[PDB]
């Protein structure tokens with residue numbers, strides 16, 4: 001009776017969490033100097049960083065449609081519904097490909113465009129896990145996640161602007177972007193790591209008003225010291241109880257550059 005959850009490799013949730021909650025991941029790939037690697041299957045994050053530091057060209061790719069078709073038909077084998085939630089259609093063709101696959105299987109699959117990435121997607125997955133445990137219908141789940149998204153704010157501080165430009169995801173010093181209905185918009189330029197954090201503090205204070213923070217996540221492109229600077233400021237400003245912190249997946253850092261951070265705040 002419980003729906004089965006599928007996602008892609010861009011949520012930045014821990015492997016322990018994904019495995020513990022039976023979340024099936026369809027991974028994206030990277031092409032580095034003419035050779036491709038499935039993220040976290042054929043290449044580790046340490047290995048990826050070594051390629052980047054060697055000035056190598058990197059591109060990313062959505063999963064092949066056949067990977068979705070195979071997964072959906074197998075997971076649906078006993079008649080269970082599948083809910084397949086993906087990073088923003090404004091950032092990747094993954095969602096569209098999942099939808100196409102859903103029209104080519106006998107299984108019953110509902111595909112959701114999260115309009116987000118990293119913990120913005122991850123927190124939707126975590127809420128989805130809870131709704132499935134509670135027995136909520138798929139149609140109601142879709143509506144509830146739409147409401148939840150209005151309470152998520154995502155910022156990214158770009159590590160290497162030239163990488164972001166090469167990757168093509170811009171829809172509209174340290175550049176700072178946000179997602180606007182799933183599309184990446186650069187909204188501010190900060191002069192330093194420290195000043196970027198002051199900007200983010202003020203923007204988060206504006207976003208939350210007198211609301212509590214339910215979850216706060218920071219994903220980072222191999223720069224924990226920058227994350228720690230943010231935690232120190234945010235601990236004083238907002239008295240955060242716990243952060244979700246992870247090294248971001250190579251598919252994301254391929255676009256942001258090394259030294260980037262992604263801040264995600266879910267308000268109550």
Ligand SMILES: CCCCCCCC/C=C\CCCCCCCC(=O)O
Nearest residue numbers: 060061062092118248255260261262
């Ligand atoms: C450092 C962690 C940052 C987390 C927030 C990222 C916000 C969006 C900004 C840039 C990342 C873009 C990733 C695009 C992946 C495309 C995959 C594909 O090839 O289809």
